[PDB]
């Protein structure tokens with residue numbers, strides 16, 4: 582099933598894009614929870630981390646490397662938090678794997 | 694002493710105790726001593742990387758492996774309703790051990806924002 586993140590990848594609806602390559606896209610979250618809050622998503626439609634395959638390991642790690650490079654480019658020199666939500670208890674809001682990167686304020690503990 | 698002298702390096706070398714869930718040549722999963730959810734464990738690389746902001750491009754497969762191990766351990770622990778994965782970077786992340794560590798939290802409803 583297609584999601585709004587598919588529409589963003591296909592450029593059918595606008596988003597504030599930070600970075601793109603052949604396999605992922607980073608863009609500011611439309612409902613930001615911190616002064617900087619962006620998502621890194623794969624272009625491959627993996628619905629949730631629980632169904633990711635072993636062959637996806639490099640792609641998932643690529644999301645994190647892109648995330649940390651984007652965080653540095655956006656000036657998050659005091660730190661940040663990365664989050665992946667799975668399912669109902671995880672609070673996953675879109676069934677397309679997405680890495681949240683949040684910073685620009687003190688992040689608290691517990692993380693929700 | 695491979696793995697560094699953070700407490701996680703010592704856990705890797707079996708010098709201080711841990712409740713281990715899974716171990717392979719690349720990583721180790723073990724329960725957090727200060728759980729923030731009914732299930733709360735960490736997945737760490739055996740290679741010492743101090744924080745995500747200094748990970749190298751060639752660490753991509755290793756970082757992805759942490760997530761794959763995290764989701765497999767979550768399934769093995771019966772977290773069938775979901776869970777949240779977290780990596781904290783630096784002061785604003787609240788990082789307290791400077792050895793890259795992926796948290797997996799589940800067994801309760803997680804809230805938004807994630808801290």
Ligand SMILES: COC(=O)[C@H](C)NP(=O)(O)OC[C@H]1O[C@@H](n2cnc3c(N)ncnc32)[C@H](O)[C@@H]1O
Pocket residue numbers: 690700711724725726727728735780781786787788789790791794
């Ligand atoms: C306030 O936020 C933070 O401190 C974040 C979570 N720091 P962070 O560096 O992201 O996570 C480190 C975690 O490592 C756990 N820990 C520390 N010592 C041991 C140990 N000996 N065995 C098992 N777990 C241990 C702490 O309870 C933290 O949850």
Ligand SMILES: [Cl-]
Pocket residue numbers: 666672673674675679
């Ligand atoms: Cl989500």
